Amino acid sequence: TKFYTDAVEAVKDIPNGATVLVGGFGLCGIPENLIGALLKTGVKELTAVSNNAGVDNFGLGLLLQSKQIKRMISSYVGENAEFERQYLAGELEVELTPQGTLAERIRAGGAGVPAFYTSTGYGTLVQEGGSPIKYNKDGSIAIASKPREVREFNGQHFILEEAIRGDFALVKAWKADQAGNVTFRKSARNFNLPMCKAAETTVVEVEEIVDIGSFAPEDIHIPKIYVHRLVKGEKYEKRIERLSVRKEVRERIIKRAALEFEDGMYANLGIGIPLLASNFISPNMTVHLQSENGILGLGPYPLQNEVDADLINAGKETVTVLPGASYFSSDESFAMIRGGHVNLTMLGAMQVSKYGDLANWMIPGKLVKGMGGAMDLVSSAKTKVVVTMEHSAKGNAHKIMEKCTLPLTGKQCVNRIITEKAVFDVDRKKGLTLIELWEGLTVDDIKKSTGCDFAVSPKLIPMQQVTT
Amino acid sequence: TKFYTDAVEAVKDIPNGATVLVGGFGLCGIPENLIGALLKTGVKELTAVSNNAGVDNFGLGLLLQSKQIKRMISSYVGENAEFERQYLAGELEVELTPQGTLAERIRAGGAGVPAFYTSTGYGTLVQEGGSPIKYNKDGSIAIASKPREVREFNGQHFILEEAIRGDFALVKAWKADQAGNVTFRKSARNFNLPMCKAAETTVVEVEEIVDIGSFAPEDIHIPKIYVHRLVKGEKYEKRIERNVRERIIKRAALEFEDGMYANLGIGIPLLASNFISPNMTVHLQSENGILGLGPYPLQNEVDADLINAGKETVTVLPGASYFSSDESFAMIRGGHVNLTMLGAMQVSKYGDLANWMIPGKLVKGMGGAMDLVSSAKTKVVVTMEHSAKGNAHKIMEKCTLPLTGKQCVNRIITEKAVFDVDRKKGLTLIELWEGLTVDDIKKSTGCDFAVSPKLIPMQQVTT
Amino acid sequence: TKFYTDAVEAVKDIPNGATVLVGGFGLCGIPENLIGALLKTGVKELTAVSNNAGVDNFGLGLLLQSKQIKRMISSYVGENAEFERQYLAGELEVELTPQGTLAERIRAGGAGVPAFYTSTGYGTLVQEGGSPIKYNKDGSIAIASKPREVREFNGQHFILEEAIRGDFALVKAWKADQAGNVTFRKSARNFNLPMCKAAETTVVEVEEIVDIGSFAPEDIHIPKIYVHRLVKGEKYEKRIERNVRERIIKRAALEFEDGMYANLGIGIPLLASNFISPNMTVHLQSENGILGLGPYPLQNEVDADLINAGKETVTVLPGASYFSSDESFAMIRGGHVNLTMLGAMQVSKYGDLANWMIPGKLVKGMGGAMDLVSSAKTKVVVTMEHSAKGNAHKIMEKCTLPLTGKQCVNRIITEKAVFDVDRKKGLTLIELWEGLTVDDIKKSTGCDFAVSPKLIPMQQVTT
Amino acid sequence: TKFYTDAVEAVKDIPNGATVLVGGFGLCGIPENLIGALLKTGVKELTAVSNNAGVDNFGLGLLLQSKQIKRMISSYVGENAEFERQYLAGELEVELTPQGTLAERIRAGGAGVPAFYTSTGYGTLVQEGGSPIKYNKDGSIAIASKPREVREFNGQHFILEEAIRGDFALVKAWKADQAGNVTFRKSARNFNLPMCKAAETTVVEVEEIVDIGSFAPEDIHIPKIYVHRLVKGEKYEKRIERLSVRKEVRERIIKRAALEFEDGMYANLGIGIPLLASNFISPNMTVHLQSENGILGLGPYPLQNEVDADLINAGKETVTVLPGASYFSSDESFAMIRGGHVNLTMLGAMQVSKYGDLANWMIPGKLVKGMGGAMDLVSSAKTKVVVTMEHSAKGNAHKIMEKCTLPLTGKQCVNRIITEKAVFDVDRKKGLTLIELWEGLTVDDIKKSTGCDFAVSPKLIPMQQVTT
Ligand SMILES: [K+]
Ligand SMILES: [K+]
Ligand SMILES: [K+]
Ligand SMILES: [K+]
Ligand SMILES: [K+]
Ligand SMILES: [K+]
Ligand SMILES: [K+]
Ligand SMILES: [K+]
């Protein structure tokens, strides 16, 4: 490891057009100083592999404002209006990439694996091609993503994804010892860790440089072999994007969703209703929440004094962890998710099809912020996928239908749908089975609000509500 | 995580014929209590996915002694007499898999990746198939290994390897907290960590159970989500398993550069590290999961959890790190090690290497050799006596012995010559031992070679 | 073979949604009676595997008019207005497949081969997938084509293509004997022959039923084992469907050599053959299954069974031969044609070729173009106007239009220059039109090129 | 096409070590003159791709006698003792290659297909590797064949086979016109036709050169484009290897096998019992016999005056064809066979396993003549495979057993077994079902003579015998 006292010296040789991996999940674990140094070098036309787009004037957003980015390879790019502006205007290319796939392709790029198979994205625009990479002024697609090959292994379809390697990686870490070994703090690890292994030149900025021997050898997150350039960050804002702090019909969906929890369960809860449901978990029930940004053991929102920019949930809100929690990298988080280790994935949806296809990441020409980890979260047949959503849309437009009309997040991946009117079990071959019916409504009422048929359980019961 | 007080209770339901992942590298990080428990359950016909075969009466060797293993899927199986006997007798199936490949296949198995590509094994028997997995009584072949598909990416050939999942994993770890999070000690991590993620039921034995909160969350090596069953092991044995050449060693010693990351094979390469100048910093990587190897320990510092890839007890230097086997081989396959220096039986004109299989009915396996030479980015230097016993050539047009890799060697150092190797141009003699002539080299080399116009007498480290 | 007297009876059991192979190239060798019978049965939602789309109200076009086709799997679909309308409107699925690939996939489908490799389509949209198979009402894409795997053999890239089998095949043939052996006439053989082997139920319509023994056993093109149902067609329409440039033609004419086998594309290459010396023997291969193309026929010699690849009625010369489409493309893919000369929209520096798709929502298909340039052994010469309308470059660093093949062009002849193309070195200007200078060429060429030290004024055939 | 008046001039440039495709099936369609010319050139160390080994001093055998062949790629090499001598002595390398695979690999080598999949050989030493290519003096294996990759398509396993191309092809044909177009006579076509397309230089010898226009364009078997060198053969012996001519317990198996025929059936009958069974076909029943050397419509053995060396069956016996017969090449014959167009394949076997594995091509260190087309003939799930064999071996050693002990011809490919004691239907999952029992024997008698269990049909009947 070569140590630098000036961030600009560490990045002055990045060529225009370089592919640069940039660490961070939201504004958590972003290489603020290295990004600031790129602003000064003015290097242009970068292909930035960055999970997110920071926010308008922060993180990658700074490089978007300066128009230094030609293309982004990212999983979720919401909360950055300049990003959206450039994207929709055709000034910026964006490959929306499933978060787990992004993490695993980056890992592959550091691990000598040129390609690998994953079921994430199978049956979606990622596999099929046609995801917009570049738009035309008029909202038409100028460059569309290319299809990924599909191959069946063990009776299931997977798509072939290729390694991502960068010319440089700009990585944020917590401490480096004097030998260049590096550790990451809490959830700020995320993509920084695998990105440190996947670029010709890795540049790491750290908050503190400590003596060699400061780390237990077993607990060096990133061995020095991967750290080519190291700079101590001149300053850190650690901007908190979303401050969530606890004190000291939708409710119907939430209270029924809360009954999906079981003791000892590992769950990943999407923003909104699913997460709100966790609030009703029995104190006598232990549920471990997994956060795809690399945390196992999410706790409640922080009391004001527990707020920590390095600890946020997947919805980018400041959070806390419970005793016995663990942090891990993004590639590990998605290995955990794709490998079906999480027992329950509960998320909102725009549409669900009769056999369980899910649409919850894109509305053509309206909502184009990426799928985040959604495609990975529903990719495992081992993980129960529960969709929680209002039964119908605007004009009582159907949301549960024969076939989704919006881009799919996954095919035949939903196992249960909970709405304010019904709970349906979903079978990928037999379809829907109404198993709970809100009191007051009739099976015929559900028929009227559902765009496909469904079997009625012979043991159909009144819809349950958590008692807490 | 479900805690158990009796190891047998934790493994009593393993089915006969189950595929069981068993952690450990050599005798380092082996689940000795879980293995002892299988001896009690008597489960049979196991397909043991285990990097090595323990030793005769220890580690996996206990299950071979009790004939509870039908097949081993391993990378190196030396140092086990009963294993040899059963394999030669046709009583045991042995499927050799490169060590990095084994690690990555297991990791894939817990990561939702059914298959992936690797350079490791391309151009060898791993890709070709055909290795004797099982013999019949008459010594004929009963089962041969299967080939792997080949596909090119960015100009290079890779082979497709598939995920390994087991029905069970028997994992050894250091500590578990009361929530079931687990950590591994020193180099005992190796395969235990990825194996914990790749089986339907993971059973972990630990040396100590600690309070929740004992670990920094950042430093939990295996989060509890992967730990299904946990037992504190009842007994831990801490078993410890363990001039021509001089000229080669002293020339090999000159391959080191300051700040270099190197992986040195057993034998001459490792001996060469003894000549590194105290003024030069070289970080030695060990494929079983260590970066920063130091000298052998004084006897009172021997630590069963810290061995090098040759299973020798070792020490580490300041700033060393430990990591799992899948990470170690991601490090190696990714070209992060600058120099891989190893011995060889033969090297071909364009750099094919044969260094893992001496013909004979017995197999020991390739260990990490195929991975170590798999990257175009890592300089591979072979250090070997120039010619074989009898004087047959070791450097030739094409190897006749099983390949470890194709066009993977960049330099050959013998006691007679140093050759640079180029996969397209072949050999260039760049150094020549005093007293020998280019013609002497020609006579003892089985292929042509260019003579560098800057050919110098062979160098020798001053240390 | 079961004989039928009513075509409807022979096809009444085709299931809705069936995949039906339909013979014919253009209107040559189409099962017009079987198609007329499907109009009567009303079977719907067919996946028609048909090289072409007939014309508006004939051949496959009848089934498009009646909306009985859900998807076409074809290689070229021009000259059909209703096809265009349905495709653009999103009422029809169109899956373009290279013509040689279509033939080989069908042959595989009857030969027990589930998949095989071909150079054809490597590096194009065929390999990449992404072509619009079906549009939605708003003009957005409903279905896109799937990619094909790529694998290297002996240094070259190929793609994996899978067998095509149908539930039924509607085959047109010339004669059947009373045993059900069948023969095909002239170029009407094309896809009929392999399609007869690739469906669960083959239905063949013939022009004449002859006595057993009418054929020499050696000369039965399709043995009866492949003919499940046979009907004599009731009606056969014998429908017949059908200076800058001069300088290019006269220079292209100089690419011919005595004894050469060439395949000449529609347009300039074919026109160049008019300048072949009566003293030179050139055998023109037609991809629809002919070797030995002759001049266009006088009107009273027009024969609906004999057309060239551009669907022009043609004649053949003495010693000509006919063969099926799978054989024709085995001939082409195998490099047996010495010269393939065709037009192009763009050619890249190292010889990538774009010549089959003009962007626009409409698709016509690649026909046999991708196969024709698929062999390293066949010399591929592009004859094209040097620059595009507007003066944009046609020869450039990289094509911007869809590729027909990568690094497949060996020579480019324009009205300004002749370039040799090498896939590694790029372009070499070897001939230069009178009055133009190397700088004029540089200004109208989008990439650099070497200038041959033997550059001569551009040659022109004397004929 | 370049015409030569001297065969030696046509082949004088074949280099030592060349791979030479040599046409012919048995002594039918062999390039006698070109082989004679190679004897004079003395070219050595050839890799001869030749379906068979001719006979001791004829066909390829001439080149084996002269020791000009280093390796043979062949499907059946019986009837040549010098061949066997060299093979067993380690003086000759031999890749035993399934006949259909050989034909299809040669076709691929001429058709631009580098590799393709086939189920022929799946589950055998061809797929697994280990077929002896070169022996050691002591009968041990010195060079073993390498495995072929396996891949599943549409629920079935196939193995990847690569194209075969030669430096030269020595092809025998019937006539050539003056332009070089070529035709083949009767069954002498076989491998000559595809071999003509799969070599850098094709050399064809013909019996007669005729005028251009002699052939109907539609009936040119091999267009001139494939014929690089053409010589009119100086002389032709057309040696008949096996003269079979008709005049003017085993019988039990034969008479029961004869009941497997159905009207309109296409069948391929192996040598011995199956072929003898065809003799009992009802004159009122039309059965089309397919010959894998390229004939459809086999008839009886020839009357003496009908004997024709160009027309032999797969067992190399002189034969006749019935009206409406057709001839075709070896690659087409095996496309017909592998594509399941033949309805019934009936052949002898050494062993059959409980689930239908068949062993009928090799006895290690005893019978090593190759599989001929056996592996292809049982490769199609569409073709009914009926094994006809004596129930038990020598010491009442079992032939029908749990698992074959001899090298397999195919796995789970047999559908019915007919012996002199029983008829078993075979199901690849449920095993054997005794459906006919010879009178006099009891189910227990069968149990004693069968090495595996079997269900007894509830409708078990006395074994039938054809009444003719
Ligand atoms: K699921
Ligand atoms: K799914
Ligand atoms: K290297
Ligand atoms: K290599
Ligand atoms: K070419
Ligand atoms: K090419
Ligand atoms: K069968
Ligand atoms: K089978």
PDB file of C-alpha atoms in Angstrom, chain C residues 1 104 107 109-119 149 151 153-154 158 160 162 165 174 177 179 181 183-187 189 196-200 212-213 215-221 223-228 261 283 285 291-292 316 318-323 326-327 329-338 377, chain D residues 1 104 107 109-119 149 151 153-154 158 160 162 165 174 177 179 181 183-187 189 196-200 212-213 215-221 223-228 266 288 290 296-297 321 323-328 331-332 334-343 382:
ATOM      1  CA  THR C   1     -46.897 -43.520 -45.714  1.00  0.00           C
ATOM      2  CA  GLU C 104     -29.416 -26.845 -39.764  1.00  0.00           C
ATOM      3  CA  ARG C 107     -32.099 -30.914 -39.813  1.00  0.00           C
ATOM      4  CA  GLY C 109     -34.503 -31.646 -35.213  1.00  0.00           C
ATOM      5  CA  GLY C 110     -34.906 -34.751 -37.335  1.00  0.00           C
ATOM      6  CA  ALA C 111     -31.410 -36.121 -36.683  1.00  0.00           C
ATOM      7  CA  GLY C 112     -31.414 -36.578 -32.949  1.00  0.00           C
ATOM      8  CA  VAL C 113     -29.137 -33.591 -32.437  1.00  0.00           C
ATOM      9  CA  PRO C 114     -30.507 -31.230 -29.851  1.00  0.00           C
ATOM     10  CA  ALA C 115     -28.003 -28.517 -30.469  1.00  0.00           C
ATOM     11  CA  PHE C 116     -24.897 -27.748 -32.445  1.00  0.00           C
ATOM     12  CA  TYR C 117     -22.485 -24.876 -33.031  1.00  0.00           C
ATOM     13  CA  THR C 118     -22.267 -22.518 -35.872  1.00  0.00           C
ATOM     14  CA  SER C 119     -20.212 -19.449 -36.749  1.00  0.00           C
ATOM     15  CA  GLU C 149     -24.374 -19.010 -26.060  1.00  0.00           C
ATOM     16  CA  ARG C 151     -18.170 -21.091 -27.352  1.00  0.00           C
ATOM     17  CA  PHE C 153     -13.469 -24.105 -31.048  1.00  0.00           C
ATOM     18  CA  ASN C 154     -10.017 -24.182 -32.537  1.00  0.00           C
ATOM     19  CA  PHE C 158     -19.375 -20.136 -32.575  1.00  0.00           C
ATOM     20  CA  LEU C 160     -25.009 -22.706 -29.912  1.00  0.00           C
ATOM     21  CA  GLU C 162     -30.917 -25.690 -30.912  1.00  0.00           C
ATOM     22  CA  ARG C 165     -38.890 -29.781 -34.476  1.00  0.00           C
ATOM     23  CA  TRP C 174     -42.452 -33.088 -57.011  1.00  0.00           C
ATOM     24  CA  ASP C 177     -44.021 -43.093 -55.710  1.00  0.00           C
ATOM     25  CA  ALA C 179     -44.559 -46.376 -51.487  1.00  0.00           C
ATOM     26  CA  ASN C 181     -40.681 -42.075 -51.470  1.00  0.00           C
ATOM     27  CA  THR C 183     -38.341 -36.349 -54.935  1.00  0.00           C
ATOM     28  CA  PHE C 184     -38.093 -32.579 -55.352  1.00  0.00           C
ATOM     29  CA  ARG C 185     -37.731 -30.597 -58.477  1.00  0.00           C
ATOM     30  CA  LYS C 186     -34.932 -28.152 -59.157  1.00  0.00           C
ATOM     31  CA  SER C 187     -34.670 -25.465 -56.522  1.00  0.00           C
ATOM     32  CA  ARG C 189     -36.292 -28.708 -52.780  1.00  0.00           C
ATOM     33  CA  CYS C 196     -39.759 -33.674 -43.836  1.00  0.00           C
ATOM     34  CA  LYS C 197     -37.551 -35.154 -41.168  1.00  0.00           C
ATOM     35  CA  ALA C 198     -38.194 -32.763 -38.394  1.00  0.00           C
ATOM     36  CA  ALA C 199     -41.857 -32.953 -37.436  1.00  0.00           C
ATOM     37  CA  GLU C 200     -43.974 -35.440 -35.581  1.00  0.00           C
ATOM     38  CA  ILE C 212     -43.075 -47.779 -57.225  1.00  0.00           C
ATOM     39  CA  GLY C 213     -39.903 -48.378 -59.194  1.00  0.00           C
ATOM     40  CA  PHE C 215     -37.284 -43.763 -59.036  1.00  0.00           C
ATOM     41  CA  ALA C 216     -33.750 -45.130 -58.969  1.00  0.00           C
ATOM     42  CA  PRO C 217     -33.312 -46.127 -55.268  1.00  0.00           C
ATOM     43  CA  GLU C 218     -30.162 -44.012 -55.214  1.00  0.00           C
ATOM     44  CA  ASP C 219     -32.164 -41.038 -56.285  1.00  0.00           C
ATOM     45  CA  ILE C 220     -34.980 -40.899 -53.829  1.00  0.00           C
ATOM     46  CA  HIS C 221     -34.491 -37.564 -52.205  1.00  0.00           C
ATOM     47  CA  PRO C 223     -37.151 -41.997 -48.371  1.00  0.00           C
ATOM     48  CA  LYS C 224     -40.718 -42.930 -47.397  1.00  0.00           C
ATOM     49  CA  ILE C 225     -39.764 -43.438 -43.784  1.00  0.00           C
ATOM     50  CA  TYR C 226     -39.986 -39.664 -43.472  1.00  0.00           C
ATOM     51  CA  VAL C 227     -43.269 -39.285 -45.235  1.00  0.00           C
ATOM     52  CA  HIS C 228     -46.169 -39.885 -42.974  1.00  0.00           C
ATOM     53  CA  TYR C 261     -17.243 -21.400 -56.894  1.00  0.00           C
ATOM     54  CA  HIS C 283     -19.787 -21.893 -60.828  1.00  0.00           C
ATOM     55  CA  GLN C 285     -23.906 -21.213 -56.014  1.00  0.00           C
ATOM     56  CA  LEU C 291     -24.837 -24.950 -57.929  1.00  0.00           C
ATOM     57  CA  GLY C 292     -24.317 -23.732 -61.496  1.00  0.00           C
ATOM     58  CA  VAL C 316     -28.778 -23.313 -64.725  1.00  0.00           C
ATOM     59  CA  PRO C 318     -24.612 -27.734 -67.806  1.00  0.00           C
ATOM     60  CA  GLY C 319     -23.490 -29.856 -64.918  1.00  0.00           C
ATOM     61  CA  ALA C 320     -25.491 -27.900 -62.377  1.00  0.00           C
ATOM     62  CA  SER C 321     -26.827 -29.587 -59.276  1.00  0.00           C
ATOM     63  CA  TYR C 322     -29.671 -29.082 -56.858  1.00  0.00           C
ATOM     64  CA  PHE C 323     -29.590 -29.738 -53.168  1.00  0.00           C
ATOM     65  CA  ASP C 326     -29.443 -27.780 -45.074  1.00  0.00           C
ATOM     66  CA  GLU C 327     -26.982 -29.121 -47.619  1.00  0.00           C
ATOM     67  CA  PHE C 329     -25.670 -24.156 -45.965  1.00  0.00           C
ATOM     68  CA  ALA C 330     -23.426 -27.024 -45.002  1.00  0.00           C
ATOM     69  CA  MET C 331     -21.718 -26.178 -48.301  1.00  0.00           C
ATOM     70  CA  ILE C 332     -21.565 -22.497 -47.436  1.00  0.00           C
ATOM     71  CA  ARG C 333     -20.738 -22.827 -43.762  1.00  0.00           C
ATOM     72  CA  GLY C 334     -18.098 -25.405 -44.590  1.00  0.00           C
ATOM     73  CA  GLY C 335     -16.178 -22.840 -46.672  1.00  0.00           C
ATOM     74  CA  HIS C 336     -16.717 -24.712 -49.913  1.00  0.00           C
ATOM     75  CA  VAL C 337     -17.716 -21.612 -51.852  1.00  0.00           C
ATOM     76  CA  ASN C 338     -14.492 -19.787 -52.749  1.00  0.00           C
ATOM     77  CA  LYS C 377     -12.190 -20.114 -45.795  1.00  0.00           C
TER      78      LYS C 377
ATOM     79  CA  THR D   1     -12.312 -30.689 -60.124  1.00  0.00           C
ATOM     80  CA  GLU D 104     -22.115 -36.999 -38.050  1.00  0.00           C
ATOM     81  CA  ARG D 107     -20.509 -34.313 -41.768  1.00  0.00           C
ATOM     82  CA  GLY D 109     -16.325 -31.298 -40.442  1.00  0.00           C
ATOM     83  CA  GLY D 110     -17.640 -30.513 -43.886  1.00  0.00           C
ATOM     84  CA  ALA D 111     -20.528 -28.335 -42.786  1.00  0.00           C
ATOM     85  CA  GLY D 112     -18.845 -25.723 -40.639  1.00  0.00           C
ATOM     86  CA  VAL D 113     -20.179 -27.239 -37.358  1.00  0.00           C
ATOM     87  CA  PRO D 114     -17.303 -27.672 -34.898  1.00  0.00           C
ATOM     88  CA  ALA D 115     -19.291 -29.729 -32.440  1.00  0.00           C
ATOM     89  CA  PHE D 116     -22.753 -30.989 -31.795  1.00  0.00           C
ATOM     90  CA  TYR D 117     -24.625 -33.023 -29.241  1.00  0.00           C
ATOM     91  CA  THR D 118     -25.814 -36.569 -29.565  1.00  0.00           C
ATOM     92  CA  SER D 119     -27.184 -39.052 -27.144  1.00  0.00           C
ATOM     93  CA  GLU D 149     -18.833 -33.428 -22.119  1.00  0.00           C
ATOM     94  CA  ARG D 151     -25.236 -31.618 -21.290  1.00  0.00           C
ATOM     95  CA  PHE D 153     -31.373 -30.698 -23.331  1.00  0.00           C
ATOM     96  CA  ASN D 154     -35.117 -31.207 -23.076  1.00  0.00           C
ATOM     97  CA  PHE D 158     -26.367 -35.733 -24.708  1.00  0.00           C
ATOM     98  CA  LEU D 160     -20.647 -33.185 -27.155  1.00  0.00           C
ATOM     99  CA  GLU D 162     -16.457 -32.623 -32.340  1.00  0.00           C
ATOM    100  CA  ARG D 165     -11.947 -33.167 -40.807  1.00  0.00           C
ATOM    101  CA  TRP D 174     -19.629 -44.888 -59.115  1.00  0.00           C
ATOM    102  CA  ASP D 177     -19.358 -36.538 -65.061  1.00  0.00           C
ATOM    103  CA  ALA D 179     -17.485 -31.506 -64.507  1.00  0.00           C
ATOM    104  CA  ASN D 181     -20.177 -34.234 -60.186  1.00  0.00           C
ATOM    105  CA  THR D 183     -22.862 -40.401 -57.873  1.00  0.00           C
ATOM    106  CA  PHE D 184     -22.647 -43.511 -55.743  1.00  0.00           C
ATOM    107  CA  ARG D 185     -24.035 -46.911 -56.429  1.00  0.00           C
ATOM    108  CA  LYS D 186     -26.416 -48.679 -54.084  1.00  0.00           C
ATOM    109  CA  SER D 187     -24.969 -49.200 -50.649  1.00  0.00           C
ATOM    110  CA  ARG D 189     -22.333 -44.670 -50.848  1.00  0.00           C
ATOM    111  CA  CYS D 196     -16.070 -36.037 -49.666  1.00  0.00           C
ATOM    112  CA  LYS D 197     -17.042 -32.870 -47.823  1.00  0.00           C
ATOM    113  CA  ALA D 198     -14.741 -33.090 -44.848  1.00  0.00           C
ATOM    114  CA  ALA D 199     -11.209 -32.962 -46.062  1.00  0.00           C
ATOM    115  CA  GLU D 200      -8.891 -30.196 -47.234  1.00  0.00           C
ATOM    116  CA  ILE D 212     -21.658 -33.647 -68.390  1.00  0.00           C
ATOM    117  CA  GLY D 213     -25.460 -33.786 -68.535  1.00  0.00           C
ATOM    118  CA  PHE D 215     -26.915 -36.850 -64.397  1.00  0.00           C
ATOM    119  CA  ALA D 216     -30.238 -35.183 -63.607  1.00  0.00           C
ATOM    120  CA  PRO D 217     -29.103 -32.047 -61.664  1.00  0.00           C
ATOM    121  CA  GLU D 218     -31.388 -33.133 -58.840  1.00  0.00           C
ATOM    122  CA  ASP D 219     -29.676 -36.463 -58.695  1.00  0.00           C
ATOM    123  CA  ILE D 220     -26.099 -35.516 -58.332  1.00  0.00           C
ATOM    124  CA  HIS D 221     -25.165 -37.107 -55.001  1.00  0.00           C
ATOM    125  CA  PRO D 223     -21.785 -31.798 -56.415  1.00  0.00           C
ATOM    126  CA  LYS D 224     -18.439 -31.083 -58.055  1.00  0.00           C
ATOM    127  CA  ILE D 225     -17.761 -28.346 -55.554  1.00  0.00           C
ATOM    128  CA  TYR D 226     -16.716 -31.103 -53.190  1.00  0.00           C
ATOM    129  CA  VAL D 227     -14.624 -33.120 -55.583  1.00  0.00           C
ATOM    130  CA  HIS D 228     -11.181 -31.689 -55.771  1.00  0.00           C
ATOM    131  CA  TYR D 266     -39.594 -49.532 -40.030  1.00  0.00           C
ATOM    132  CA  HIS D 288     -39.339 -51.956 -44.039  1.00  0.00           C
ATOM    133  CA  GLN D 290     -33.391 -50.181 -42.561  1.00  0.00           C
ATOM    134  CA  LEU D 296     -34.101 -48.622 -46.560  1.00  0.00           C
ATOM    135  CA  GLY D 297     -35.979 -51.583 -47.946  1.00  0.00           C
ATOM    136  CA  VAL D 321     -33.548 -54.646 -51.723  1.00  0.00           C
ATOM    137  CA  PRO D 323     -39.314 -52.502 -54.539  1.00  0.00           C
ATOM    138  CA  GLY D 324     -39.416 -48.904 -53.357  1.00  0.00           C
ATOM    139  CA  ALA D 325     -36.090 -49.162 -51.550  1.00  0.00           C
ATOM    140  CA  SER D 326     -33.764 -46.206 -51.228  1.00  0.00           C
ATOM    141  CA  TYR D 327     -30.090 -45.673 -50.587  1.00  0.00           C
ATOM    142  CA  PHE D 328     -28.556 -42.859 -48.634  1.00  0.00           C
ATOM    143  CA  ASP D 331     -24.672 -39.507 -42.088  1.00  0.00           C
ATOM    144  CA  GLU D 332     -28.249 -39.599 -43.317  1.00  0.00           C
ATOM    145  CA  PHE D 334     -27.701 -42.197 -38.673  1.00  0.00           C
ATOM    146  CA  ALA D 335     -29.737 -39.014 -38.748  1.00  0.00           C
ATOM    147  CA  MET D 336     -32.630 -41.372 -39.599  1.00  0.00           C
ATOM    148  CA  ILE D 337     -31.682 -43.704 -36.725  1.00  0.00           C
ATOM    149  CA  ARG D 338     -30.775 -41.097 -34.104  1.00  0.00           C
ATOM    150  CA  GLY D 339     -33.881 -39.091 -34.957  1.00  0.00           C
ATOM    151  CA  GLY D 340     -35.974 -42.074 -33.946  1.00  0.00           C
ATOM    152  CA  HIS D 341     -37.415 -42.651 -37.414  1.00  0.00           C
ATOM    153  CA  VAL D 342     -36.868 -46.342 -37.202  1.00  0.00           C
ATOM    154  CA  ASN D 343     -39.720 -47.807 -35.124  1.00  0.00           C
ATOM    155  CA  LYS D 382     -38.659 -43.022 -29.780  1.00  0.00           C
TER     156      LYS D 382
END
